[PDB]
């Protein structure tokens with residue numbers, strides 16, 4: 420199946436011009452846990468943000484131009500991205516906004532982190548129609564000495 424993973428501020432905000440104004444190591448650990456040993460599909464702006472290949476995962480970058488880094492795989496369409504993943508139990512779509520919108524209609528699972536933060540952003544997670552999604556796991560954590568904001572992990576499945 421296809422899954423999306425994202426961290427959402429209030430108002431579904433996922434990105435802005437610069438890095439997001441939060442320090443959330445427990446969320447990063449969650450991201451790493453849920454993506455290791457799976458292929459990850461991302462857009463070019465997300466690739467540039469991350470700044471390097473994510474280790475232990477097949478990295479697939481969407482761009483309409485030829486690749487500029489021979490360490491990862493570069494594709495020019497949603498279908499080509501999916502084919503490049505091969506025969507796996509779970510493909511992870513890791514953003515950003517333009518990519519999440521394209522893959523949400525194909526997805527069977529969402530891994531969301533809801534962060535209690537107000538951030539004016541320019542990039543949003545797509546609207547996910549309630550009738551089409553069921554929540555299967557939730558876990559709340561408060562802000563603390565190592566995490567700047569409170570964070571609630573959720574996993575939803577399509578219905």
Ligand SMILES: NC(=O)c1ccc[n+]([C@@H]2O[C@H](COP(=O)([O-])OP(=O)(O)OC[C@H]3O[C@@H](n4cnc5c(N)ncnc54)[C@H](OP(=O)(O)O)[C@@H]3O)[C@@H](O)[C@H]2O)c1
Pocket residue numbers: 424425426427432433434435436437438439461462463464465466468481482483484494495496497513514515516517518519521542
């Ligand atoms: N809080 C979070 O979870 C989270 C997660 C991921 C990303 N983000 C943030 O999201 C922002 C990036 O989102 P974004 O929407 O600006 O960019 P994006 O989705 O990372 O990348 C967009 C680029 O991807 C390529 N692309 C996408 N779909 C394509 C298709 N069907 N065919 C060919 N190429 C395709 C295009 O590259 P070309 O222009 O080369 O054609 C396009 O300009 C960043 O600020 C990042 O930090 C936040």
Ligand SMILES: Nc1nc(=O)c2nc(CNc3ccc(C(=O)N[C@@H](CCC(=O)O)C(=O)O)cc3)cnc2[nH]1
Pocket residue numbers: 424425426446447448449450451465468469473474513514531532
């Ligand atoms: N829940 C979640 N949180 C995120 O921060 C997030 N970020 C993206 C896009 N950006 C990034 C930026 C950096 C790293 C990164 O460096 N990850 C490391 C672990 C970080 C650590 O150990 O400190 C990795 O190996 O996954 C991942 C995704 C996509 N979905 C997400 N989803």
